[PDB]
C-alpha cells in the first residue's frame, strides 16, 4: 500500500549512495595542492573606455567574436551594436517591445538575438542586402519569460525560459528540435561549453544540470549551494565551470568528480552576485557583485586579487573577449565600461 | 586607405545619435505604469474600463498631452521574484485588489503579504504604490445581508471605530464604512511601518461604480512627481 | 545541499496541544527568515505564519492572533510552531519554508506547489 512512499524512501537511499561515492573519491583537497606555488599579486586595472548611448539599464551586454565589435541591450527599447576600438555606435535598432532580458550575438557576425517579457525570441541580420535591419525570424514556443540565449551555429540556437523548460530551435524553418525539463524553478542562466558538444543551465531551485544537445538527456546535476543561481559561466578548458549564486558565494565545479572544488566566499561582502566570467586562462575569476563593485579572485589561491570600484548602480552583465585582451562590464547607470 | 572607413562611420554614427536623441525626446515625454493584482479582482472589467480601449499586455493612452502606458503581466508563471525586478524605472504601481474576497479564501492577508512584500525590496524601495478598494458594492451587499463577518478573520475588528476625518457617502451604513475603512487603514499602517522618506502611498476607493477614474490616476502621478521633487531640493 | 524535515502530527481531539519542529540542512540557519505556510484539502495555500532574523519581529495571520505560537533557535537550526486549543477547521497540511534571498525581508512561498524550499509538510487532523 501506497508505494509512492517506498519509491520515495528508494531515491533517498539512492541519494545517500551518491554522496556516499562522492565521499569516497574526495581524500584530498584543492587547497592544499595550489600550495608551494607563486600568488598573482595585487593587480590594478584601469578602466580603458566609456560608452554612452543607452537611456535605460543595460542588461546582457553580450561580447563578439571578432574581439572588435560588440553588443547590448537596454530596457528602453533599442539594440546597440558597437565598435570598441573607435568608440562608435554600429548599428542601433528598434525593437518590438520594451523590456528585454538578454542577446546572443551570433559566432558569423551575422544574427543577432533578443527576449524579455514577451515571451518571444527576436533574431535579426546583420549582412543587409538593402542597408536596413530587419526582424528575420520570430520564435514563440514558451510561456514563461526567457532568460538567456547563446547562439550554437548559424541556423540554431538554445535559449531558457522560465517556465522550467529550455528548447533547442531551428530557424531555418521556424519549428523547435529538443527540449529540456527537469528544473523545478525557472532557469536563469546556461553557457555552452568549448567542445559544442554539451551545456551547462542554472536554475532558481539551487541547482546546475548538464545538458546534451544531441541527446535531450540530462548527463549530471550538482546542488552545492544554497540560494539562487543566477550566472553560470564554463571553463575555457573543458573539465571545470563557476557559478555565481545569490548568497555573496561563488563556487567552482568539476564534471569528471562530479563535486565542487572551491567556494571564493568572504566574509566582508553580503550582496548577491549577477554575472561571473572566465579570463583566458582561468587564472582569473571576475565576478559581478551587487554592492556597485566588481571582483576579481585568484581562482587557485581563493584569495582576492582586485576590486573594481565606478559604476554607482549596480552592475549586471561582465563580460570577456575571446582573445582575453579586455573586458567589459555593465551596469544599471547606463554606462558600459571596457577595461584593460 | 582609412579615408573610407573613418567618413562612413562618422557619418552613421551622427545619423543614429541624432536620431536616437529625437526618440530620447519622446521616450521622456511619456510615463509607465506597473498593473497588478491578487488576481480575480477584476482585471478585465477594470482594463476595460481604466485604459478605455504575450506576456507583456501593454496599453498606451493619454490625458492632458501626458502619455501613460499601463503594462500587465496577466500571462506569466506563479513565481514573482526574477522577473519583478525589470519593472524599477516604472513611476507607479497600480495594486488593484478585491475587498470582498476574505472568505471566498483569506485573500486579503495574501494582498497583505504581497504589499509588505513589495514595499520592503531592495529595488523596488523607491516606487510609490497606487491602492484600490474594488468591490464596494458587494462589501454592502454582503454586510448588509450577513454573508459573512470580518471579526472572524480579524479579532482586532472589534476594537476599531470609524474615524472622524472620514468621507461617508449619504445613505451609507456605518458598518460599510467601518470595514471599508478598516481595510484601508491596515493598508496604510502596512505601508507607513518601514517608510523611507522616499515613496508614499495611495488609497482610493472606487471600482464599485463604472465610471471615469482616469483622472485619479493622472493626479496621483502628478503629486507624486511633486512630491519627489519636493524631497529632491530637501524642501519636503 | 537544502534539505527540510519536520516532526509532529496527529489525531487529537478539538481543545488540545500539538508540538511541530522544523530542521533545516544544507544552508546556514542563523542568517534567514523561516516561516510556516499550511493549505487545506480542497483550498489554496495559506501563509499562518513567520520569524525573523533574530526573533524580534512576530507576524500571526488573523486567524491564528493569540492561538498559536512560534520560535526559532539557532542552536539546534530548528523552529518549533505551538497549536494551542487547535480550532476544528485546522485540518491541513502544513510546511516549513525559507526565504530565498537573505538580508532581505522579501517573503512568498505561498506560490502554488512548486518551490525549492518548502519541506514535506505534515497532516494535522482534529478529530471528533
Known amino acids: 500500500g501506497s508505494e509512492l512512499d517506498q519509491l520515495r524512501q528508494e531515491a533517498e537511499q539512492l541519494k545517500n549512495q551518491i554522496r556516499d561515492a562522492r565521499k569516497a573519491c574526495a581524500d584530498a583537497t584543492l587547497s592544499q595542492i595550489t600550495n608551494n606555488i607563486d600568488p598573482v599579486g595585487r593587480i590594478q586595472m584601469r578602466t580603458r573606455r566609456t560608452l554612452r548611448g543607452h537611456l535605460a539599464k543595460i542588461y546582457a551586454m553580450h561580447w563578439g567574436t571578432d574581439s572588435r565589435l560588440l553588443v547590448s541591450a537596454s530596457q528602453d527599447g533599442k539594440l546597440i551594436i558597437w565598435d570598441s576600438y573607435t568608440t562608435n555606435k554600429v548599428h542601433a535598432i528598434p525593437l518590438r517591445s520594451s523590456w528585454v532580458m538578454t542577446c546572443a550575438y551570433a559566432p558569423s557576425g551575422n544574427y543577432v538575438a533578443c527576449g524579455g517579457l514577451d515571451n518571444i525570441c527576436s533574431i535579426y541580420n546583420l549582412k543587409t542586402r538593402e542597408g536596413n535591419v530587419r526582424v528575420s525570424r520570430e520564435l514563440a514556443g514558451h510561456t514563461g519569460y526567457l532568460s538567456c540565449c547563446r547562439f550554437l551555429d548559424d541556423n540554431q540556437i538554445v535559449t531558457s525560459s522560465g517556465d522550467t523548460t529550455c528548447a533547442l530551435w531551428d530557424i531555418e524553418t521556424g519549428q523547435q528540435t529538443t527540449t529540456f525539463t527537469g528544473h523545478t524553478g525557472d532557469v536563469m542562466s546556461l553557457s555552452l561549453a568549448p567542445d559544442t558538444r554539451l551545456f551547462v543551465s542554472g536554475a532558481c531551485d539551487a541547482s546546475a544540470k548538464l545538458w546534451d544537445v544531441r541527446e535531450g538527456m540530462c548527463r549530471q546535476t550538482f546542488t552545492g549551494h544554497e540560494s539562487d543561481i543566477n550566472a553560470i559561466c564554463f571553463f575555457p578548458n573543458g573539465n571545470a565551470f563557476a557559478t555565481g549564486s545569490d548568497d555573496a558565494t561563488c563556487r567552482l565545479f568539476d564534471l569528471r568528480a562530479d563535486q565542487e572544488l572551491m567556494t571564493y566566499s568572504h566574509d566582508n561582502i553580503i550582496c548577491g552576485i549577477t554575472s561571473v566570467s572566465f579570463s583566458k586562462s582561468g587564472r582569473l575569476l571576475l565576478a559581478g557583485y551587487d554592492d556597485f563593485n566588481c571582483n576579481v579572485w585568484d581562482a587557485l589561491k581563493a584569495d582576492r586579487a582586485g576590486v573594481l570600484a565606478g559604476h554607482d548602480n549596480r552592475v549586471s552583465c561582465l563580460g570577456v573577449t575571446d582573445d582575453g585582451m579586455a573586458v567589459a562590464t555593465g551596469s544599471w547607470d547606463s554606462f558600459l565600461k571596457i577595461w584593460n | 586607405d582609412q579615408r573610407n572607413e573613418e567618413k562612413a562611420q562618422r557619418e552613421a554614427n551622427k545619423k543614429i545619435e541624432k536620431q536616437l536623441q529625437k526618440d530620447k525626446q519622446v521616450y521622456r515625454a511619456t510615463h509607465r505604469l506597473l498593473l497588478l493584482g491578487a488576481g480575480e479582482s477584476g482585471k478585465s472589467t477594470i482594463v476595460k474600463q481604466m485604459r478605455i480601449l504575450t506576456g507583456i499586455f501593454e496599453t498606451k493612452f493619454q490625458v492632458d498631452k501626458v502619455n501613460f502606458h499601463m503594462f500587465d503581466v496577466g500571462a506569466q508563471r506563479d513565481e514573482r521574484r526574477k522577473w519583478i525586478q525589470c519593472f524599477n524605472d516604472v513611476t507607479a504601481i497600480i495594486f488593484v485588489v478585491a475587498s470582498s474576497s476574505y472568505n471566498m479564501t483569506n485573500r486579503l492577508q495574501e494582498a497583505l503579504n504581497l504589499f509588505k512584500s513589495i514595499w520592503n525590496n531592495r529595488w523596488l524601495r523607491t516606487i510609490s504604490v497606487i491602492l484600490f478598494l474594488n468591490k464596494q458594492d458587494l462589501l454592502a451587499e454582503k454586510v448588509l445581508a450577513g454573508k459573512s463577518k470580518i471579526e472572524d478573520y480579524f479579532p482586532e475588528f472589534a476594537r476599531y471605530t470609524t474615524p472622524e476625518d472620514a468621507t461617508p457617502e449619504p445613505g451609507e451604513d456605518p458598518r460599510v464604512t467601518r470595514a471599508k475603512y478598516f481595510i484601508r487603514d491596515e493598508f496604510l499602517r502596512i505601508s507607513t511601518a518601514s517608510g523611507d522618506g522616499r515613496h508614499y502611498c495611495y488609497p482610493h476607493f472606487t471600482c464599485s461604480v463604472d465610471t471615469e477614474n482616469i483622472r485619479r490616476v493622472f493626479n496621483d502621478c502628478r503629486d507624486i512627481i511633486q512630491r519627489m521633487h519636493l524631497r529632491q531640493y530637501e524642501l519636503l | 545541499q537544502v534539505q527540510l524535515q519536520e516532526s509532529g502530527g496527529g489525531l487529537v481531539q478539538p481543545g488540545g496541544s500539538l508540538r511541530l519542529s522544523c530542521a533545516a540542512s544544507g544552508f546556514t540557519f542563523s542568517n534567514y527568515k523561516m516561516n510556516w505556510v499550511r493549505q487545506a484539502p480542497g483550498k489554496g495555500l495559506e501563509w499562518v505564519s513567520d520569524i525573523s532574523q533574530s526573533g524580534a519581529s512576530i507576524s500571526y495571520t488573523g486567524s491564528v492572533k493569540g492561538r498559536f505560537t512560534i520560535s526559532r533557535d539557532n542552536a539546534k537550526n530548528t523552529l518549533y510552531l505551538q497549536m494551542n486549543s487547535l480550532k476544528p477547521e485546522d485540518t491541513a497540511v502544513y510546511y516549513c519554508?525559507?526565504?530565498?534571498?537573505?538580508?532581505?525581508?522579501?517573503?512568498?512561498?505561498?506560490?502554488?506547489?512548486?518551490?525549492?524550499?518548502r519541506g514535506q509538510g505534515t497532516q494535522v487532523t482534529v478529530s471528533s
Open positions: 519554508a525559507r526565504c530565498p534571498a537573505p538580508f532581505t525581508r522579501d517573503c512568498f512561498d505561498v506560490t502554488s506547489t512548486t518551490y525549492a524550499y
